[PDB]
Design a protein around this ligand. Structure first.
Ligand SMILES: Nc1nc2c(ncn2[C@@H]2O[C@H](COP(=O)(O)OP(=O)(O)OP(=O)(O)O)[C@@H](O)[C@H]2O)c(=O)[nH]1
Ligand SMILES: Nc1nc2c(ncn2[C@@H]2O[C@H](COP(=O)(O)OP(=O)(O)O)[C@@H](O)[C@H]2O)c(=O)[nH]1
Ligand SMILES: Nc1nc2c(ncn2[C@@H]2O[C@H](COP(=O)(O)OP(=O)(O)O)[C@@H](O)[C@H]2O)c(=O)[nH]1
Lengths: 430, 195, 48, 431, 431
């Protein structure tokens, strides 16, 4: 009834969707077969006459391997076969390939299934698009689909949980190129874009989870827990319910500035669990710690503009107010002069469910801090030099040109990220 | 009046401090949001029923007796509370019937009040997009490669400044062309908020 | 017919589930055992 | 036979109204199924003020619940006292106002307001004589504040002479729950000033302080704060529902409190609020109730009375009490604190006495203070609104819902006019 | 002792009649074996209106079932009350009319019509006194429309003075079932205007809406629609069957409803039609019944009364009720909605009261409205008929059954004249 349509594009999108849907199935009690032994699942699942609940999700990818892993995995009887959409040729880390030549038919079929899915929803709170800025499928096809949704669906709230490349560590070479292109695209389509960095989540797993060998499964589990914390107010009741439509108005000062840091707390393994108090004040301070940011961007360089806190579990409103008042009186945390309030608290009575086989511990309290802060322009500043350093020699440019792209598009994307730099500088300024 | 004057002062100071034009500003992007909202509402209202959704209930039960209202219960009979959708297909509700443009805004004068400009040639920023594209084409024809040196940072013109705002989408043009007759039926004329 | 009996059984089950959710909501809303004003024990209203 | 139509707006308003209806149903001996089980004649004597007779012995609250999102009143229906309400009185949308006053007043509330007024008219016309309407909601929220202001405007237009009572949860000073609280509050204060006849100001942080100092709770949820607010809500009208030695209806309280039409904002408080530890140690007496009443910590509004001066102050006492005791106590209070009381009003206390106290209390007293202290609350709201407005943070949402920019200017101007009125009467000298 | 001869035509007519007889037998306490197990004297007091006594205690309906295909009344016999009907009253042919009005009226209906009239005359002569006949069938079908109209003509010739009441299921406006529905309806309306004294227009789409919006059902089969039709068919004649404080027979209803002979087409509705959830929550009073009665959503005719003007309107209430209440409610309705009522009739409501409500219900009320709104339904049927007749599609089947193309034009002209009369009395001004 408060349905949100889930879209997962590219390898990273689909692989974080794996963890997300495992988490949602565990949270609502839905077995992998499709049915469970009120109406809290309607946000993520549509129940059929036979009792089988099918998730309102769409797995879009131009490479068949990742989707076939889902088709053969434990969740083969849960997902809809036509909802899993598989391409023939991968985008090959080419934004032009994923946005101009291969992506057209796939996105047409994607909008077909998305229209069918949205028909089965009475209301529609919005879309949750999980993709990977830094690869052709994520960048190109994701940008194309976001344009499609923005134009046709229109005023539905699209939350893009994008993963940008890390400052130093990376796995692709044209990753600055396609990242700049997809940021140029999604600056104008998504309503709230959640920033993620693999380096930051790796550091989180290394220090807090004590995982010396973090992997994509752990990263995606953490991301899934963050998104479940985001959506807990849609599916479970609690004091200070926060809505998907409430997020933007409470968090977006200006149309372009909608990129948001996400930070979960606590991140503690079972062995370290139940050994500290993990009170509301302590978990709030941990959430505001610079290291807890899921993006390699120090909050101290910038100033917070808005901070939306999602509390899950046994949280009392005086405790949230006392913790946040201590945060305001803290000297390290600095807000802009023009947003004296800058805080959007929302509590929920459902503690975060734990995935068996994971490292996260069963904690009766959880906080997801999603903050709009002017600091995040630093990551765009990094990519703005990573891009132009290669573009000066026009390396790998012919690959993008071959699939229907032009020098003007590269130049315009660089211009637009420079514009975003100036926008962050200006929101930081008095 | 005093707050208007301070808006000019604040915007001038910010533009001086940063370097971008006062029009290409975070604060002065409210009208763009309003135009986008109006466009989305009009595009949602102007759709054939298949595009609006092939829902058997929405298509038949609402349409019967031209009631156009559906009962959505919120649980069992014991809840007994439900939503009347009360949706009339092909008509804007009176609340959203109004189109709004700022006619006194000094900065919005070049566009002419914004609004809906529902004709495809009028969507977005046609003049700015044409000028930017022509300049790019002239540079390409003269062989003037851009981004020669990394120490030269980009100018930083906005999406609307370069003519790639959300209202400038090629999909927006295509879909308004598709839905044009019904879009005319809903909104016969573009208000011309400037005058 | 058996249909009416099954419908009545479903209605009773719905009532029981609603009572369970109501108990959960009351327990979560109230923080201390006694009443905050007019100090007195408080229970679920019930009386049905 | 002077009926009151209750209306609840937004999540905060709906929760507070549900707790209030639980309290009033208890006070009138109504079980959650609606049957009367009070075993007391006075409880049924004036049950028609809040309730209507159903087909059986059931009694239905004359309450109308509004929202733009279904979750809050799904929880309300599934709550302990959710089954009393007629489902036809639940007027809700599908897409909630995203804490956007513009969304709750112009775009999304405008379609729902037709059904809202239809239900309001249906409930009001059935009333024999209508004392008025009471609307519970929160400033600083989209659906709550927006629909509350819109409905208050509509009801003011339809029923000009009928009483308008509002219980608005004003945003707290230190901690702001939502970011756009100053915008929503400034927009809603503008409407309440113009339309609402009588308005109570509430602050969550003041409630936390009172419940952690006086009541000394360890983990006070919104359930306990809503219980306090509901206690005040009952105590304000108990003279209508029960016989009183010196009774006072809502209009009598309004006449005795409001000196000038726009200075109708009040800070309210309830006594005696006692911690469970010192319940046996305290002496439940009229002087004790008065001293606890006039304490600055007892006020549920953030503003403290000491900074301002009391224009007027009403106190509705409940219980078998000595009117001489009450009058002497209040005269002694005014004499001792003459600095805190306005000079040009010879008597600053409106004492009411009801013969029926709430269950468990042999005596009780609710306090309603019109003082110039609320000036500082409005001043803080203005200081936040100016800071956010100056740069237009989050203003594009209100612009995109079809609101002129000068609507904010007009709201802020009216609020500053109210502030300067309070200052002028605070420093106004006799002759 | 004023007998009514029930006749069913076509599969739709037969199923509606089966549901109606089930409902009537339940009201009179007759088990499907025909024996009386009702345990109430008023039930047997006037059972002879619809039933005849067999050798034992068995009661046989005065019903006559008509068809050209045997499967439909095979299903009727297989239905729960299939064995009460006398087997000799089943008149049915070999080849069903393929939705062909010409086949059901001229070629195949001619042979069966002799047997049909024989059974009708045999049932009518057994009657002590005959109020008349009630014929339930569906326009837009071959055997139903054709045989019904032909039998109606024959019975009108035989017994001109006796009442003829028709329950015709006019093809639905939006969603049509068969292609030739406009042809059959156009041919049948021309016959009904000339022959039928009193006619009720029913629409499956209107029944679906009443059961979707009032009854709030999920998957309403034809059985539910037939159940509502049967409830109204009972409620119209319950005055003949039960004692009433102010009784009114079919002839009285026709006299008070029909101002001019050709304007005898009515829209009908039943109250209280209630959802399961709000059964406890609804206040079951005469004003509530009237409010639900005059709602357009309660009409079983697709045409909404708001567009037209109520020429006349009868309200047959059932239950121990206040005649002052009923009369005041009717006068208040007329005064409030005077725009929707014709001016040159001082009182447009014929109120009747029966003392015995339907089983399970404390109260009920059936409404019969003669209003000019049905003009738009006939207009729409003409808008389909003219479009198809311009290109003469599917006309060859009718032409091959031996009916002139002149008959189509004459029927269309008659229907257009009826539309013109309805508009004329819609816009007629007094003096
Ligand atoms: N956090 C996280 N990131 C991932 C994961 N898998 C891939 N990524 C990131 O996603 C980026 C590329 O994503 P995709 O575009 O989907 O890769 P693809 O599916 O082969 O599609 P193309 O690269 O366009 O051909 C890589 O640079 C990785 O950094 C994952 O499991 N977790
Ligand atoms: N006393 C009390 N206050 C509440 C409750 N829920 C929310 N609030 C307060 O109400 C304020 C506004 O929320 P609200 O208007 O309901 O949001 P909306 O429903 O979207 O309009 C917030 O600042 C909360 O602090 C509650 O249950 N009790
Ligand atoms: N209300 C109702 N309508 C029916 C039922 N069965 C059929 N109809 C409708 O009646 C219309 C006419 O069909 P009908 O006259 O029975 O066919 P015929 O008997 O062969 O002439 C069809 O379009 C059906 O939609 C029923 O049981 N109830």
């Amino acid at each position: 009834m408060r349905e949100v349509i889930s879209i997962h594009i590219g390898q990273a999108g689909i692989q974080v969707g794996n963890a997300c849907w495992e988490l949602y199935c565990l949270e609502h009690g839905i077995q992998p077969d499709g049915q469970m032994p009120d109406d809290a699942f309607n946000t993520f699942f549509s129940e059929t006459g036979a009792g089988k609940h099918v998730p309102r999700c769409i797995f879009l990818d131009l490479e068949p391997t990742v989707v076939d892993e889902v088709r053969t995995g434990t969740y083969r009887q849960l997902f809809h076969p036509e909802q899993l959409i598989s391409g023939k040729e991968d985008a090959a880390n080419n934004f032009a390939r994923g946005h101009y030549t291969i992506g057209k038919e796939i996105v047409d079929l994607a909008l077909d299934r998305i229209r069918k899915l949205a028909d089965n929803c009475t209301g529609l709170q919005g879309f949750l698009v999980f993709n990977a800025v830094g690869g052709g499928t994520g960048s190109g096809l994701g940008s194309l689909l976001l344009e499609r949704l923005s134009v046709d669906y229109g005023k539905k709230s699209k939350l893009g949980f994008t993963v940008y490349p890390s400052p130093q560590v990376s796995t692709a070479v044209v990753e600055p190129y396609n990242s700049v292109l997809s940021t140029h695209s999604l600056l104008e389509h998504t309503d709230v874009a959640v920033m993620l960095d693999n380096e930051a989540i790796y550091d989180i797993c290394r220090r807090s989870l004590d995982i010396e060998r973090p992997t994509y499964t752990n990263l995606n589990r953490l991301i899934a827990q963050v998104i479940s914390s985001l959506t807990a107010s849609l599916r479970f009741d609690g004091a200070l319910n926060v809505d998907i439509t409430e997020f933007q108005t409470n968090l977006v000062p200006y149309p372009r500035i909608h990129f948001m840091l996400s930070s979960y707390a606590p991140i503690i393994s079972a062995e370290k669990a139940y050994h500290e108090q993990l009170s509301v004040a302590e978990i709030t301070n941990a959430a505001f710690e610079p290291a807890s940011m899921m993006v390699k961007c120090d909050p101290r360089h910038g100033k917070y503009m808005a901070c939306c806190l999602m509390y899950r579990g046994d949280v009392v409103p005086k405790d949230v107010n006392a913790s946040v008042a201590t945060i305001k009186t803290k000297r390290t945390i600095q807000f802009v002069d023009w947003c004296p309030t800058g805080f959007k608290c929302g509590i929920n009575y459902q503690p975060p469910t734990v995935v068996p086989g994971g490292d996260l511990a069963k904690v009766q309290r959880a906080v997801c801090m999603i903050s709009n802060s002017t600091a995040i322009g630093e990551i765009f500043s990094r990519l703005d030099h990573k891009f132009d350093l290669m573009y000066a020699k026009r390396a790998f440019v012919h690959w993008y040109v071959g699939e229907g792209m032009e020098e003007g598009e590269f130049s315009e994307a660089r211009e637009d990220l420079a514009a975003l730099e100036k926008d962050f500088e200006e929101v930081g300024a008095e | 009046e005093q707050q208007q004057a301070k808006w000019d002062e604040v915007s001038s100071t910010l533009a001086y401090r940063v370097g971008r034009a006062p029009t290409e500003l975070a604060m002065q992007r409210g009208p763009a949001w309003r135009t986008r909202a109006e466009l989305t509402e009009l595009l949602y209202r102007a759709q054939p029923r298949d595009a609006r959704g092939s829902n058997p209930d929405e298509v038949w039960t609402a349409s019967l007796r031209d009631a156009w209202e559906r009962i959505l219960p919120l649980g069992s009979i014991f809840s007994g509370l439900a939503i009347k959708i009360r949706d009339r297909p092909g008509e804007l509700p009176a609340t959203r019937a109004a189109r709004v443009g700022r006619p006194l805004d000094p900065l919005l004068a070049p566009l002419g009040g914004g609004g809906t400009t529902l004709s495809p040639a009028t969507l977005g920023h046609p003049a700015a997009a044409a000028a930017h594209a022509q300049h790019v084409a002239t540079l390409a024809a003269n062989g003037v490669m851009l981004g020669a040196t990394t120490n030269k940072p980009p100018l930083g013109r906005s999406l609307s400044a370069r003519g790639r705002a959300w209202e400038d989408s090629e999909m927006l043009k295509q879909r308004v062309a598709e839905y044009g007759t019904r879009l005319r039926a809903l909104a016969p004329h573009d208000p011309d908020f400037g005058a | 017919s058996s249909g009416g009996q099954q419908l009545a059984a479903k209605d009773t089950a719905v009532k029981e589930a609603r009572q369970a959710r109501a108990v959960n909501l009351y327990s979560k809303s109230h923080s201390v055992s006694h009443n905050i004003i007019t100090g007195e024990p408080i229970k679920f209203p019930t009386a049905g | 036979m002077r009926e009151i139509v209750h209306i609840q707006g937004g999540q905060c308003g709906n929760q507070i109204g549900a707790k209030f209806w639980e309290v009033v149903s208890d006070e009138h001996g109504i079980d959650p199924t609606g049957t009367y089980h009070g075993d007391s004649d006075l409880q049924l004597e004036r049950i028609n003020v809040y309730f209507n007779e159903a087909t059986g012995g059931r009694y239905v609250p004359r309450a109308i619940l509004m929202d733009l999102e279904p979750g809050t009143m799904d929880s309300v229906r599934s709550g302990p006292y959710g089954q009393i309400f007629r489902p036809d009185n639940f007027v809700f949308g599908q897409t909630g106002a995203g804490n956007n006053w513009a969304k709750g007043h112009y775009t999304e509330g405008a379609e729902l307001i037709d059904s809202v007024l239809d239900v309001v008219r249906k409930e009001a016309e059935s009333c024999d004589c209508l004392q008025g309407f009471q609307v519970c909601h929160s400033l600083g929220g989209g659906t709550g504040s927006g629909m509350g202001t819109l409905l208050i405007s509509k009801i003011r237009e339809e029923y000009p002479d009928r009483m308008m009572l509002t219980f608005s949860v004003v945003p707290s000073p230190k901690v702001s729950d939502t970011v756009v609280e100053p915008y929503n509050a400034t927009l809603s204060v503008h409407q309440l000033v113009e339309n609402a006849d009588e308005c109570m100001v509430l602050d969550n942080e003041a409630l936390y302080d009172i419940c952690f100092r006086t009541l000394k709770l360890t983990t006070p949820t919104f359930g306990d704060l809503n219980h306090l607010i509901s206690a005040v809500m009952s105590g304000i009208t108990c003279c209508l529902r029960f016989p009183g030695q010196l009774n006072a209806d809502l209009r009598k309280l309004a006449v005795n409190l409001i000196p000038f039409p726009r200075l109708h904002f009040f800070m309210v408080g309830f006594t005696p609020l006692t911690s469970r530890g010192s319940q046996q140690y305290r002496a439940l007496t009229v002087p004790e109730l008065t001293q606890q009443m006039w304490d600055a910590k007892n006020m549920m509004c953030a503003a403290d009375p000491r900074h301002g001066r009391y224009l007027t102050a009403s106190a509705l006492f409940r219980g078998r009490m000595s009117t001489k005791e009450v009058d002497e106590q209040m005269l002694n209070v005014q004499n001792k604190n003459s600095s805190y009381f306005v000079e040009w009003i010879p008597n600053n206390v409106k004492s009411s006495v009801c013969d029926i106290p709430p269950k468990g209390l042999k005596m009780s007293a609710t306090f309603i203070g019109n003082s110039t202290a609320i000036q500082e609350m409005f001043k803080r709201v203005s200081e936040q609104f100016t800071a956010m407005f100056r740069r237009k943070a989050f203003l594009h949402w209100y612009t995109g819902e079809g609101m002129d920019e000068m609507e904010f200017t007009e709201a802020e101007s009216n609020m500053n006019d109210l502030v300067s009125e309070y200052q002028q009467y605070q420093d106004a000298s006799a002759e």
